[PDB]
C-alpha cells in the first residue's frame, strides 16, 4: 500500500503524489446525477422535522428510493448504479445535509449489502441485490452483541446444523444494529461448530444472510439517541431462525474474512461527508460574522473569529484531500489493501468534525445554543461520528499495529521529491524529514519492545498520530501541486492552506517523535499509569478537598 | 494583585504560596450546613425530570428557598447567611448536580442581588435584600440588548427624567436575561442624559432597581436552549416603566462602575462548580470501566482509558486549586482587584469541562450516546459554560489587555522558591523560568507594538494562555506544598498530578513564548489572516473541488 511502507521510512511515490484524475466524460455523468439529488436534498428534505420527530417521513424515504441512492455502489447488472469510490465520495458530501439519512444510507450500503457484494455467490447476488438496490429491501450488519457479564468483543451467537443437514438453526442476540427496525436482510455472524481430520470441537465464525421472513427474528423499540434521531437503531434477537445452507456468505467457518472485508473497506467517504458539512458551516457562520456589528466593527474583522474560519477551511481542505486520495487508490485495477488510510481518514475527520462544529457554535455565541438555529442539531449529530464505524481509540491501535506488522516482517527478514511544485518546497522537505524520523523511531520501538508492544497503548497512540499527520501532509501536497500545475481557480488559497497545515503537523510530529525515546524527560507515560491505576483501584477521585485539615 | 505583577516577571510569593487555610470552626460550620443540602440534591432532586420537562418543579424550588440557597452571600443582617468566598465555592460543588439549578441560583446571586449589595444604599438593602434572600423575590441582570442593525455591545436603553423630577421613565428591551420569567427585581442599565457646567448633552450609563410591580415590564416566552432546559431565559421589555428616583444604584451616571463590579465579582466559583462535576464523572465512569470486560480484560486495564482518567483527575485538581486560591485571595480584608484570576478560572474551567465531558462520554462508547444515561444531559449542559458568564474569547482579551495596561503604566513610569516543598523542586524552577520569560516577552511586545497591541487579537490570545498556565502552575504548587507540609491523606497522588500538570504547562508555555517573537518561523498569523480575509470576503469556501478540471 502506501501507509504500510511509511513505517519503513520510505515514501512510496507514483501512487500518491500524482493526484487522482477523473476523466471529463465521467465528471459530466456525476454532475448530471448530482443535479436532481442536490435539488432534492436542498429543498425537499426537512432536517429539523426529522430531528424533532425522530422518524424519517415515508415520502422522503420513497423519494430517496426513486433516486436510487440505496444502490449507489451496487453493480449495474444487479439493478444498482455501479459508482466508483470517488463518485461515491462525491455523493457523500451532498447527502450529509440531514445526518439521519447519511447514517441510514451508509449503514445499508457500506456495511449492509457490502457483504453480499464482496463474498456472495453469483446466485445470491441475483436474488438479493436487485431488491436491495431498488430500496424495497434494507440491509443491516449484525456483528456486535450486548455484553452482560461477558466479553464485549466475543461472539456468543450460535448456529447449529440440523439433523437432516438442510438448514442451520440460529440463536443469539445483537445490539447497536442500525436499521434494525427497517431491515429485511441481515448479515449475521455466528459461531458454528466445525469438525475436521483432527476431530476437535473447534468452532469458527460464519456469516449468514438472514431474512426477516425466516421467522424467529424480533427487534425491540428504537433507542433514544442524542443526535441522529431519524436513524432506527434497535437490537435484534434471532430465536431458532431457520437459515438455509445456501444462505452462507463464502464458506462455513470462513466468516472472519468476510467481517474483516466489510468493515475495513469503508469509512473513507466519511472524510468527504464531514467536509461537505464543514463547508456548509463556513457558508452559514460567515453570513452571520459579516452582517453583525460589535464594537463598531464587523465580527469578521476580529482576529479570534478569523482564526476560527481559517482553521475550519484548513480542516476541510485536508479532509477532502485525504478522502479523494484514499478513494483514488481504491479505484486502481485489482484489489488493493488500503485499510490503514481509511481508519486515518475516519479518525481525522471525526476529530475535526467535533472541534470545528463546537467552534462554529461558539462563533454565534448564545444564539447558536438554542433550538431555533441549525447549529444545535449539527452539534448533536456530529458526536456519533467518533463512535460510528469504529471508536476513534480502537482505530489508533488498528492503525499502529497493522503497520507494525508490516515493519515487523521486513525487519526480521532483513536481519535474518521532484514531484511537488517548487513553490511547495518548504513543506516537502519537512515531510521527508518526518518520514525518515518516523521510520527510524518505528525501528527503534520494534527493537526495544517487540511482541510486548500490545501492552503499550500510549506508545501506539503517538505512532498512530504521527502517521495520521504524515498522510495529511502528503494528501495536501499532491492536491496543491496538481492545482498549481493545471492552473485551477485561486490555487494560491490552496497553497496557503497546504503550507499552513504542513508546518503545524510538522511541529506536532516533531513533538511526538521526541516522546518515543528512552531518555525523554518530557514523556508522561509512567506518571499517567500510576495516577490512573490509583484512581481506578479506588474507583473515585483520590485527592482530598483543599479545605481539608488534619490533626 | 498577583496576575497583574505576573506581567512584570515578578512572582509575589506572599499572597499565593501559603495556601488559604480555613480554621476548624468554619470547617465545622460549613460541614453542618452541608448534609441537609447534599442529601436533598442527591435524593430529592430529579435532574432527568427537570431536563425532560423543561421546568423546575415548584416543590424543588420551594425546598431550595427553605434551605436558604437564594441568600448564600447576602449579609446575615439582611436575612441571608453571609457565607464567604471559600464557603460559596464549597456549596457550588454540591449545587452543580443539576445544571439547571446552578444557573438559576448563580444568575440570582452572582449577577442578581449582587448589585444591591455592592452599590445599594443602606435603605435600599433594608428593602430588597430581606425578600431577595428569603427566595420570595428573584433578581435578574439586564445589560445586553438585541443587536438588530446596530452594535451588539452599546446600550440603546433610554431613561428620561420626568417633568416633575420625581421618577425616571425607562424605555428599552433586553435579551438573554436569565430568570426573566421569574424575577421580580431587575438591575437594569440604561443611558440617561446628564447636563454639567459644559452644557453638553453627554449621556452616561446608570443602573436602576426595576420592580415588575412598576408597570410596563413585559417578557416573552423562554428560549429553547440545548442543555440547561430547566432555566428560564427570556427577553424583558420595558415600555414606559416609572422608576422612582430613589431606586438608582449609587449615583446617576455611575452605572458603568456598578456593571463592571457585578461582572468581575462572580466568575471565580465556576472552577469548583465543574471540578465538583468532573469528580462525579470519575466515579460513574470508573465503575463502568471496572465492571466491563473487553478482550478478556478490564476496560480499566487499557492505556487509552487510563490516560482519560488521569487527564480528568489532573483537570479537576488544577480547577480546585485555582478556584480555592482565587477565593482565598478574595477573602482578604479590604477589596482586592482579583478580576483577572476569575476570568482565568472561568476560561480554564470551561475548556476543561468541555474536553473532559466529551472524553468521558467517549469512554462509554455507544451506551453514553443515548438518553438513558446521565452523560447525554451532562454533555449538553456543559456547552453553555463556554458562553455563560462571558464568552471565552472575550475573556482572553480581557485578561491580556488588563494585564498589559498595568505593565504599560509600570514601563512608562520606569522609562520616563523556598516556599515549595523540596520534592516539588523540578516544577518550581520551570514556573520561575516561564514567569521570567513571560515578563521579558511582555516587555518586548509592549515596546514593539504599543497601542497597536489593541488590534492584534492573536498575540493577546497567546499572552492569556501563558498567563492562565502560570496561574495553574502556581495554584497546584501551593496546594501540593500545603498537602505535603500538613501531611494530608494521599499527598503523593497530589504531587504526581501537580508535577504532571507543571510539565505539560511548561511545554505549552515554551511553545507559546517561542511563537511570540518577530523572527519565529513557527508563527502562523500573517498566513491565517490572508486565508481568513479571502474566505470572509467571499463568504464561502474558496478552494475548488478535487475533481475540478481546467482546459
Amino acid at each position: 500500500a502506501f501507509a504500510k511502507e511509511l513505517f519503513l521510512g520510505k515514501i512510496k511515490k507514483k501512487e500518491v503524489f500524482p493526484f487522482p484524475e477523473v476523466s471529463q466524460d465521467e465528471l459530466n455523468e456525476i454532475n448530471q446525477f448530482l443535479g436532481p439529488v442536490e435539488k432534492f436534498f436542498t429543498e425537499e428534505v426537512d432536517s429539523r422535522k426529522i430531528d424533532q420527530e425522530g422518524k424519517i417521513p415515508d415520502e422522503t424515504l420513497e423519494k430517496l428510493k426513486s433516486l436510487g441512492l440505496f444502490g449507489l455502489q451496487v453493480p449495474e447488472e444487479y439493478g444498482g448504479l455501479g459508482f466508483s469510490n470517488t463518485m461515491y465520495s462525491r455523493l457523500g458530501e451532498i447527502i450529509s445535509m440531514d445526518g439521519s439519512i447519511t447514517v441510514t444510507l451508509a449503514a445499508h450500503q457500506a456495511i449492509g449489502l457490502k457483504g453480499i457484494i464482496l463474498a456472495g455467490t453469483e446466485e445470491q447476488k441475483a436474488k438479493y441485490l436487485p431488491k436491495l438496490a431498488s430500496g424495497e429491501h434494507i440491509a443491516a450488519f449484525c456483528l456486535t452483541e450486548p455484553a452482560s457479564g461477558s466479553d464485549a468483543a466475543s461472539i456468543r451467537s450460535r448456529a447449529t446444523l440440523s439433523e437432516d443437514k438442510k438448514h442451520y438453526i440460529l440463536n443469539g442476540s445483537k445490539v447497536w444494529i442500525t436499521n434494525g427496525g427497517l431491515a429485511n436482510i441481515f448479515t449475521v455472524f455466528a459461531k458454528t461448530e466445525v469438525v475436521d481430520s483432527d476431530g476437535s470441537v473447534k468452532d469458527k465464525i460464519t456469516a449468514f444472510i438472514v431474512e426477516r421472513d425466516f421467522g424467529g427474528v424480533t427487534n425491540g423499540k428504537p433507542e433514544d439517541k442524542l443526535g441522529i434521531r431519524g436513524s432506527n437503531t434497535c437490537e435484534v434477537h434471532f430465536e431458532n431462525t431457520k437459515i438455509p445452507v445456501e444462505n452462507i456468505l463464502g464458506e462455513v467457518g470462513d466468516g472472519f474474512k468476510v467481517a474483516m472485508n466489510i468493515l475495513n473497506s469503508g469509512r473513507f467517504s466519511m472524510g468527504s461527508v464531514v467536509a461537505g458539512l464543514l463547508k456548509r458551516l463556513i457558508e452559514m457562520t460567515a453570513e452571520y460574522a459579516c452582517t453583525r456589528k460589535q464594537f463598531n466593527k464587523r465580527l469578521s474583522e476580529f482576529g479570534l473569529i478569523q482564526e476560527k474560519f481559517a482553521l475550519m477551511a484548513q480542516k476541510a481542505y485536508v479532509m477532502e484531500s485525504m478522502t479523494y486520495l484514499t478513494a483514488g487508490m481504491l479505484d486502481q485495477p485489482g484489489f488493493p489493501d488500503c485499510s490503514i488510510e481509511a481508519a486515518m481518514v475516519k479518525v481525522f475527520s471525526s476529530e475535526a468534525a467535533w472541534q470545528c462544529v463546537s467552534e462554529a457554535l461558539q462563533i454565534l455565541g448564545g444564539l447558536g445554543y438554542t433550538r431555533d438555529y441549525p447549529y444545535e442539531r449539527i452539534l448533536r449529530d456530529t458526536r456519533i461520528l467518533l463512535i460510528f464505524e469504529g471508536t476513534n481509540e480502537i482505530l489508533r491501535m488498528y492503525i499502529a499495529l497493522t503497520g507494525l506488522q508490516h515493519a515487523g516482517r521486513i525487519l526480521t527478514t532483513r536481519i535474518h521529491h521532484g514531484v511537488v511544485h517548487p513553490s511547495l518546497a518548504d513543506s516537502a522537505n519537512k515531510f521527508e524529514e518526518n518520514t525518515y524520523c518516523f521510520g527510524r523511531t518505528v525501528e527503534t520501538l520494534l527493537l526495544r519492545f517487540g511482541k510486548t508492544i500490545m501492552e503499550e497503548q500510549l506508545v501506539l497512540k503517538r505512532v498512530a498520530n504521527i502517521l495520521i499527520n504524515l498522510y495529511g501532509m502528503t494528501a495536501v501536497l499532491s492536491r496543491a501541486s496538481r492545482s498549481i500545475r493545471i492552473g485551477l481557480r485561486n490555487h494560491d488559497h490552496e497553497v496557503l492552506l497546504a503550507n499552513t497545515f504542513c508546518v503545524e503537523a510538522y511541529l506536532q510530529n516533531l513533538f511526538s517523535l521526541s516522546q518515543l525515546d528512552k531518555y525523554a524527560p518530557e514523556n508522561l507515560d509512567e506518571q499517567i499509569k500510576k495516577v490512573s491505576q490509583q484512581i481506578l483501584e479506588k474507583r473515585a477521585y483520590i485527592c482530598a478537598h483543599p479545605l481539608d485539615r488534619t490533626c | 494583585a498577583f496576575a497583574k505583577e505576573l506581567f512584570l516577571g515578578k512572582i509575589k510569593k506572599k499572597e499565593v504560596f501559603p495556601f488559604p487555610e480555613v480554621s476548624q470552626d468554619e470547617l465545622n460550620e460549613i460541614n453542618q450546613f452541608l448534609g441537609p443540602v447534599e442529601k436533598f440534591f442527591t435524593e430529592e432532586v430529579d435532574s432527568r425530570k427537570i431536563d425532560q420537562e423543561g421546568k423546575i418543579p415548584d416543590e424543588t424550588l420551594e425546598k431550595l428557598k427553605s434551605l436558604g440557597l437564594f441568600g448564600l452571600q447576602v449579609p446575615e443582617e439582611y436575612g441571608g447567611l453571609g457565607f464567604s468566598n471559600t464557603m460559596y465555592s464549597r456549596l457550588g460543588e454540591i449545587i452543580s448536580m443539576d445544571g439547571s439549578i446552578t444557573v438559576t441560583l448563580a444568575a440570582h446571586q452572582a449577577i442578581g442581588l449582587k448589585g444591591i449589595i455592592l452599590a445599594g444604599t443602606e435603605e435600599q438593602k433594608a428593602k430588597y435584600l430581606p425578600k431577595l434572600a428569603s427566595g420570595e423575590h428573584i433578581a435578574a441582570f439586564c445589560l445586553t440588548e438585541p443587536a438588530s442593525g446596530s452594535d451588539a455591545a452599546s446600550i440603546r436603553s433610554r431613561a428620561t427624567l420626568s417633568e416633575d423630577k420625581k421618577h425616571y421613565i425607562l424605555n428599552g428591551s433586553k435579551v438573554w436575561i436569565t430568570n426573566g420569567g421569574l424575577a421580580n427585581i431587575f438591575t437594569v442599565f440604561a443611558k440617561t442624559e446628564v447636563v454639567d457646567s459644559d452644557g453638553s448633552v453627554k449621556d452616561k450609563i446608570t443602573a436602576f432597581i426595576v420592580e415588575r410591580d412598576f408597570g410596563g415590564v413585559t417578557n416573552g416566552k423562554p428560549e429553547d436552549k440545548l442543555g440547561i432546559r430547566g432555566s428560564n431565559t427570556c427577553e424583558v421589555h420595558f415600555e414606559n416603566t416609572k422608576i422612582p428616583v430613589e431606586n438608582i444604584l449609587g449615583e446617576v451616571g455611575d452605572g458603568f462602575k456598578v456593571a463592571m463590579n457585578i461582572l468581575n465579582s462572580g466568575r471565580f466559583s465556576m472552577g469548583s462548580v465543574v471540578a465538583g462535576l468532573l469528580k462525579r464523572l470519575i466515579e460513574m465512569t470508573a465503575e463502568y470501566a471496572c465492571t466491563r470486560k473487553q478482550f478478556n480484560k478490564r476496560l480499566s486495564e487499557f492505556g487509552l482509558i487510563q490516560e482519560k482518567f488521569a487527564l480528568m483527575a489532573q483537570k479537576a485538581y488544577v480547577m480546585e486549586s485555582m478556584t480555592y486560591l482565587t477565593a482565598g485571595m478574595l477573602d482578604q480584608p479590604g477589596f482586592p482587584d482579583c478580576s483577572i484570576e476569575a476570568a482565568m478560572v472561568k476560561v480554564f474551567s470551561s475548556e476543561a469541562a468541555w474536553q473532559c465531558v466529551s472524553e468521558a462520554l467517549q469512554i462509554l462508547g455507544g451506551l453514553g450516546y443515548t438518553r438513558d444515561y446521565p452523560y447525554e444531559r451532562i454533555l449538553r449542559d456543559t456547552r453553555i459554560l463556554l458562553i455563560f458568564e462571558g464568552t471565552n474569547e472575550i475573556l482572553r482579551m480581557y485578561i491580556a489587555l488588563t494585564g498589559l495596561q498595568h505593565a504599560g503604566r509600570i514601563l512608562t513610569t520606569r522609562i520616563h522558591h523556598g516556599v515549595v516543598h523540596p520534592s516539588l523542586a523540578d516544577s518550581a524552577n520551570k514556573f520561575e523560568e516561564n514567569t521570567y520569560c513571560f515578563g521579558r516577552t511582555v516587555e518586548t511586545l509592549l515596546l514593539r507594538f504599543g497601542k497597536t497591541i489593541m488590534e492584534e487579537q492573536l498575540v493577546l490570545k497567546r499572552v492569556a494562555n501563558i498567563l492562565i498556565n502560570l496561574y495553574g502552575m502556581t495554584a497546584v504548587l501551593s496546594r501540593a506544598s500545603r498537602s505535603i507540609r500538613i501531611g494530608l491523606r494521599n499527598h503523593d497522588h497530589e504531587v504526581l498530578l501537580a508535577n504532571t500538570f507543571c510539565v505539560e504547562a511548561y511545554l505549552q508555555n515554551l511553545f507559546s513564548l517561542s511563537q511570540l517573537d518577530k523572527y519565529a518561523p513557527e508563527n502562523l498569523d500573517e498566513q491565517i489572516k490572508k486565508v481568513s480575509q479571502q474566505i470572509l470576503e467571499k463568504r464561502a469556501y474558496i478552494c475548488a473541488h478535487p475533481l475540478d478540471r481546467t482546459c
Binding site: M260, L401, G450 | -
Partner: peptide, 15 residues
Amino acid sequence: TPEEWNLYYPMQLDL
C-alpha cells in the same frame, strides 16, 4: 484468543 477480536486490531504479532 478468539478470532473475532482481531476484527478490532491484531491481537498477536508474528515476531
